[PDB]
Structure 1
Amino acid sequence: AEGMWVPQQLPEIAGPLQKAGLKLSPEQLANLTGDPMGAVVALGGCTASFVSPQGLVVTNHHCAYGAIQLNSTAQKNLIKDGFNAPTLKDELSAGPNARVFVLDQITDVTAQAKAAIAGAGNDPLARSRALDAFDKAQVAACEADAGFRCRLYSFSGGNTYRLFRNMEIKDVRLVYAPPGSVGKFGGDVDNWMWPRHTGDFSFYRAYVGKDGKPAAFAADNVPYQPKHFLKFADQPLGADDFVMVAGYPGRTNRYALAGEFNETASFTYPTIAKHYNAVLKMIADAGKADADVKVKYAATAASMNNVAKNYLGQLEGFKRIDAAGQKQAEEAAVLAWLKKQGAAGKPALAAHAQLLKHLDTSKSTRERDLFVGQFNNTSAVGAAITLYRLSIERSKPDAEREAGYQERDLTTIEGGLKQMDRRYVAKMDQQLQTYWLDQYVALPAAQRDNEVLNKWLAGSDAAAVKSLVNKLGGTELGSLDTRLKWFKADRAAFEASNDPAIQYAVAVMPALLKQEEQKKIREGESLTARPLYLQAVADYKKSQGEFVYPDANLSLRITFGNVMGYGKDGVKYTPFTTLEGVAAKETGEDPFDSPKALLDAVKAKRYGGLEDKRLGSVPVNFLSNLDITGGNSGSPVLDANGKLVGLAFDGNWESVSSNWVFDPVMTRMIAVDSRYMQWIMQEVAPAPQLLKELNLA
């Protein structure tokens, strides 16, 4: 099924669900804090779910990569080796910014929100301020009670607003990670690819204080006791079987302008992919000189690889289906339907006009902005900026601070300063600074008009760069102790410091505030215009029959469909892989270097009671026609009776383009089978204490 359906749409997908094979009633799914929906949880930009009454939480390996990285060293490398905690007291802190969000409540605030936007009238900046003050106020009242964190979501370009209330668990700990050769089998070669043979899973545990409320890490913290948790399935999952996912997809752009798509396709994806592949070459090369670099920058590298490869796959996805054409046609098809309507269609035409005008701004300045943006987001310069910004925002009363820099956000900023001690190496940061500076000075002279940066460079040669990196080399912000002091410090200490990173942060901060202000004016303009056009586009879509659901916005969504393969001229991809496919791809070298205990077990056909008689072996990964995207990683896959049969982690090569234009023929989710998870834990990287917790011993 196409669709990232919101739970409020359960009425209209009820029939389709049952017809696909659901054997629960949809009313049981409509209880979002009941069984099974209430066990689905957000981590941030991943999904997860509870699977035990003592607060055990399962998700993807690549979602846990962060925490695993944080706790790794070059001597004791848990990314490579995996990890297991036989008792509570062995479990490792996932870090200060690890979160588990448990849904308390959703409420519609559409009428209020719109009334606040209307109360600002004409002026764009006011329209943006008013929405911002509405958000803050709704969030303050919702978060009055301790241990809740609330968020406001814009749907359908602003036609709908809903407020989510979550309990925010702040003490999360690692319990189990398989070896990297299992969790990340096939690495960057197999990424976005079927056939796939990857054991992408890991386990956390949620803790709270003795008193029951979320607390930061503490030795006397205790396991959280969830209302609801999923059970592993006792019914073997075969081809054509019903499946569904619930989760927190991030962003889709299916209702975007043909122009937005065109700027993305011909500038952003090729540019980013190109430069990422350069930076990655540089990190790999440094990482062989010193294995501390390899480990401290491994989360950055994994994430950049994923993005760069994704972008190359979307470009090609666009040729496969000519998305420039379809966008053009559907866009002109709508502008026509509106032309027909009895004077009531004229306001949406005016909206289209405004939205067009947004796109042209950057043609000459867009390489520059990337390069400057990326330099300002290297570690020491980025810390310096964050810190200096906060000191200004601390001037103001709390209600008027920028989102990001309120009281309720201090915890998180402070956690980031801490986390960077595990992700920072001076000699590597200097190479990154050098790289993006080298790309700025290589611009045409006309496009190199960042005045602060031109002053600090005093020229456009390679020697200007070298000399500025040497000067930025005298910063103290590579010390945690220093960072934590600056975290407390007054705006005036920043303005009077000779630390070079700080000096630079102070020099750039006026332009940064001005860029930020223009952005808010654009948001302000489109806050009556996007919702108008997106309603028209949707009414037109409902005209031709067809499915209408909102673009993803980090909120909870349901997708459903069936286990099934897909086809290309000469090829039919079957819906399952098995143990033998894993062995068959053995090269004895990264990324195909499975543990020996795996190769042994497969050679001896030690299936441990998990084989599917229809396949002849234990299945590994599987395909289905569910609609997911970034953020859906780690989402639980449920069978017709709401038991866990796999985790979502990826899609196939053809699916990546469907962020923009969905293709029902060749769009597929890749999930890891609950049977492979259990197999690995029995026969390869044993977790006996954990197989007992999940009642599988």
Structure 2
Amino acid sequence: GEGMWVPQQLPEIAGPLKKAGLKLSPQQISDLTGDPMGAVVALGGCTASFVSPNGLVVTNHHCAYGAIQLNSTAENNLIKNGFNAPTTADEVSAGPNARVFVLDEITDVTKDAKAAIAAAGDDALARTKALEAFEKKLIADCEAEAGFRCRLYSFSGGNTYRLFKNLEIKDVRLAYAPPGSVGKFGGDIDNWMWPRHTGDFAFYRAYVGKDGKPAAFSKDNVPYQPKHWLKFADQPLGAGDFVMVAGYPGSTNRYALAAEFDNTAQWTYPTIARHYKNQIAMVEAAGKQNADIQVKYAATMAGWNNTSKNYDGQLEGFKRIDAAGQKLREEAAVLGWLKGQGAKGQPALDAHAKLLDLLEQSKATRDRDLTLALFNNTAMLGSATQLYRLSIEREKPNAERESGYQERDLPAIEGGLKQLERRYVAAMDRQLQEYWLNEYIKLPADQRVAAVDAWLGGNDAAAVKRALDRLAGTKLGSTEERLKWFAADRKAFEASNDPAIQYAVAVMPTLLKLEQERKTRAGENLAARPVYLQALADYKKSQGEFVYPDANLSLRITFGNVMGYAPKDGMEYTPFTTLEGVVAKETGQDPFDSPKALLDAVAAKRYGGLEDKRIGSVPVNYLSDLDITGGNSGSPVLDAHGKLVGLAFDGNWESVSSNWVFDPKMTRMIAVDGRYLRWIMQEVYPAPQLLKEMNVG
């Protein structure tokens, strides 16, 4: 059922957990470095878990797609073929930026954090800088232990702060991916849909130095030995059974002003979707010509497809449940409520007023802000602005450098410049720069950027064309030139005749000023958000409704039971799909082109000891009423005894609007059954070595 519960809410959900079927004690789940919860790890925008005492980590194929794509060429396509390492020496690096984070400690630091914030008094910008300075000092102290990375999380609008501390494993290697026709069966046609038939799984292995401490990739590193790992279930999962997920959902917007919603529905989601589709169309074409462009842009392409379909689905789900309607009506009812109680509820009513005007403000410039952001996110302009900004920050003491530009951020910066080699083709990026310039010129005169106007030389196909021809002369296209500039000083940037770098030097003043304009808006928000959101929460508690914070990339628990749903009268989706359903979709064309070994094994009812009698086949995917969102991919699904029953990977089409307005009747998690993992690894693309290491063959 509903809720992305923080581990500190476990007493609130103890009884609900038992009633839904948990047969572990709430005590045992509370131990976030215990069995099983100490097996659950964060990847950075996906979840995973350890499944052997030798560092084996399972997550989704689409979570590992980055890594598989980084290791793929046109002439050896791991995406298409799969990857299997018969020994640990065979495992290939997942990339310099790949991580496994292993939870170490959580601490409330709320009291201190709002003290620091208050200590700056009445100046919006100073309030932001004081929180920034508080966070940096905290993190600096927490990361003083070698091998740990820490993070500060603000919950419920800034009513609570916690500090998380993680072991940072920095050598992650690919051990197994099934072929892409299993890992992503049904492609973007089945994405966000049920019935689903997707084998969305892949395995990493986690490595440290010989001293047992984190290290970056080296051939002398050896497998991490986790304190805790998951065991596969020995009881078959069936309809109605208890399941639970722990993981790292990224963001929700369930506490929001109606105007935040209207803006998102009417503007943000339609605009982003349109832009995303336009770039897909461009890249799709060029890649039909050019297998190098196709393999190199595959990850970016999957991203654009996934987000644009999600927003299409959110827009549809709003209309289905009248979300505009509900938001209006709960806002009226909460505003009603507040004046309602006169003296006491006046702080909250003021907050509402502030927040709302802050939001008209961000609204005045939103087209400018998006367009410039995405224009600067193309490859060579991104690289030049990031690298120039780093040269600016390096002049300050580390403690004062912008987050993202401190010493602690250097590994990831340098890592990104090397990963970009596998994701960049100049003829392709030129077309994207063109696309974004065209949209820039499009902007109204009041919505323009001085420095960009001037850099460009006026508003037409001709100038666009000059820009593109000039930028084409950058040397930032090679990894070596990027890594040269990664180490160069600010003066060398200001001296450069590289046209990409000249663009950066030209606009950076504007970008820093707009960053100040954002830090100022956030500071005002920081006063007004926690009060108002605390009232939203208070009203909900007064309606007996469930109260938990919007997702914020921290660890959450969700629980429920295996069940389907009913999209329309006269029909129901069943909780499971089956092997026969995979083969019924077969067309021999992508994305419905399963391996021959699967097709033959299914036509033979070779079920490998994995059949579930109740469904008369091996289960493939399943639905449950858990409450998950982007960031939960790869999360282990555990049964009543804490055993592994599947991996979370998607939501059904009608679920995605629950980011804004939760609908219990149509919100389901889609998970890959652990018996399908097993079956694929026995009969289709075998990994007898991983099965044995997981004590299942």
Q: Same fold (TM over 0.5)?
A: yes
Cα shift readout 1:105-139 (whole Å, capped 9, x = no counterpart)? 00000111111111111111111111111100110
In structure 2, the residue corresponding to 1:97 is in which secondary structure? coil
CA contact (8 A) 1:625 1:669 kept: yes
SS of match in other structure, 1:181: helix
1:266-665, aligned counterparts within 5 Å? Answer: 266-361=266-361, 365-444=365-444, 446-447=445-446, 449-567=448-566, 568-665=568-665
In 2, the alpha carbon distance for the partners of 1:443 and 1:144 equals 47
Give the structure 2 partner of residue 114 of structure 1.
114
Q: Shift of residue 643 of structure 1? A: 0.2
Per-residue deviation, residues 367-423 of structure 1 (Å, max 9, x unmatched): 333222211110011000000000010010010000000011111101111111111
Amino acid at match of 2:158: G
Cα deviation, 1:611-638, whole Å, max 9, x if unaligned, reads 0000000000000000000000000000
Residue of structure 2 in register with 1:80 after alignment: 80
Give 1:618's aligned amino acid. Answer: V
How many percent of aligned residue pairs carry the same amino acid?
78
Corresponding position of 1:129: 129
Q: Secondary structure at the match of 1:344?
A: helix
Secondary structure at the counterpart of residue 220 of structure 2: coil
Question: How far is the alpha carbon of 1:452 from its aligned partner?
Answer: 2.2
Aligned-partner Cα distance in 2 for 1:119–1:647: 45
Deviations 1:324-378 (A, max 9, x none): 1111111111111111215111111111010000111255643333222211110
CA contact (8 A) 2:192 2:310 kept: yes
How far apart are the structure 2 equivalents of 1:404 and 1:358? 25
Report the more deviating stretch, 335-344 or 538-547. Answer: 335-344
**1:113 partner letter:** A
1:438/1:634 Cα in 2 relative to 1: closer, same or farther (>3 Å)?
A: same
Contact 1:6 1:556 in 2 (8 A): yes
Q: For the Cα contact (< 8 Å) 1:440–1:448, is it kept in 2?
A: no
2:237/2:645 contact within 8 Å kept: yes
Give the distance between the partners of 1:466 and 1:178, measured in 2 at CA: 44
1:389, 1:520 → 2: CA distance?
A: 17
Distance 1:449 1:52 in 2: 55
Unpaired runs of 5+ residues, structure 2, are: none
Pairwise CA distance, 1:477: 0.5
Q: Do the aligned residues in 2 keep the contact of 1:384 with 1:505 (CA within 8 Å)?
A: yes
Query: Shift of the alpha carbon at 1:441?
Result: 2.2
TM-score, length-normalised on structure 2? Answer: 0.99
What is residue 25 of structure 1 aligned with on the other side?
25
Query: Does the CA contact (< 8 Å) of 2:207 and 2:222 recur in 1?
Result: yes
Once the two structures are TM-superposed, the CA of residue 104 in structure 1 deviates from its matched residue by 0.3
Structure 1's 494 and 647: CA in aligned 2 closer, same or farther, altered over 3 A?
same
2:151 and 2:165 in contact (8 A); partners too: yes
- Cα distance, 1:451 vs. partner? 2.3
* 2-structure distance, mates of 1:93, 1:570: 50
Amino acid at match of 1:16: P
Secondary structure of the 1:45 match is: coil
Does the aligned pair in 2 maintain the 1:297–1:423 contact within 8 Å? yes
Q: Secondary structure in 2 aligned to 1:630?
A: coil
Q: Distance in 2 between matches of 1:364 and 1:257?
A: 18
1:193-239 residue CA offsets vs partner (Å, 9 max, x unmatched): 00000000000000000111000000010000000000000100000
Contact 2:455 2:506 in 1 (8 A): no
SS in 1 for 2:646: strand
1:66 is matched with 66
**Counterpart of 2:320 in structure 1: which amino acid?**
R
Q: Aligned equivalents of 2:7 and 2:361: distance in 1?
A: 38
Query: Alpha carbon RMSD of aligned pairs, Å?
Result: 0.9
2:658 pairs with 1:669: no
CA distance in structure 1 between the partners assigned to 2:488 and 2:135 by the alignment:
28
2:231 counterpart residue number: 231
Q: Quote the offset at 1:547 in angstroms.
A: 0.7
Paired AA for residue 138 in structure 1: L
1 CA distance for matches of 2:464 and 2:347? 52
Distance 2:387 2:629 in 1: 33
Deviation readout 1:498-525 (Å, 9 max, x if unpaired): 1000111011101100111111111111
In structure 1, the residue corresponding to 2:34 is in which secondary structure? coil
Deviation (angstroms), 1:182:
0.2
Contact 1:185 1:594 in 2 (8 A): yes
Question: Offset of 1:448 from its aligned partner?
Answer: 5.9
User: What one-letter code is carried by the residue in structure 1 that aligns with 2:565?
Assistant: Y
Who is 2:100 aligned against?
100
User: Hey, what's the Cα distance between the residues in 2 that align with 1:442 and 1:529?
Assistant: 35
- What is the CA-CA distance between 1:438 and the residue it aligns to? 1.5
Write the letter of the residue equivalent to 2:112: Q
What's the CA shift string for 1:77-106, capped at 9, x where partnerless? Answer: 000000000011110000000000000000
State the shift of 1:526 in Å: 1.4
Contact 1:42/1:100 (CA < 8 Å) preserved in 2? yes
Distance in 1 between residues matched to 2:26 and 2:692, nearest whole Å = 32
Q: Distance in 2 between matches of 1:594 and 1:588?
A: 7
Structure 2 Cα separation of the partners of residues 376 and 228 of structure 1: 43
CA contact (8 A) 1:364 1:447 kept: no
Measured at CA, do residues 364 and 122 of structure 1 come closer, stay the same or move farther in structure 2, by a change above 3 Å? closer
Letter in 2 for 1:305: N
What is the distance in 2 between the residues matched to 1:613 and 1:556? Answer: 35
Asked if structure 1 preserves the Cα contact closer than 8 Å seen for 2:251 and 2:551, the reply is yes
SS of the aligned residue for 1:41 comes to strand
Q: Conserved in 1, the CA contact under 8 Å of 2:209 and 2:221?
A: yes
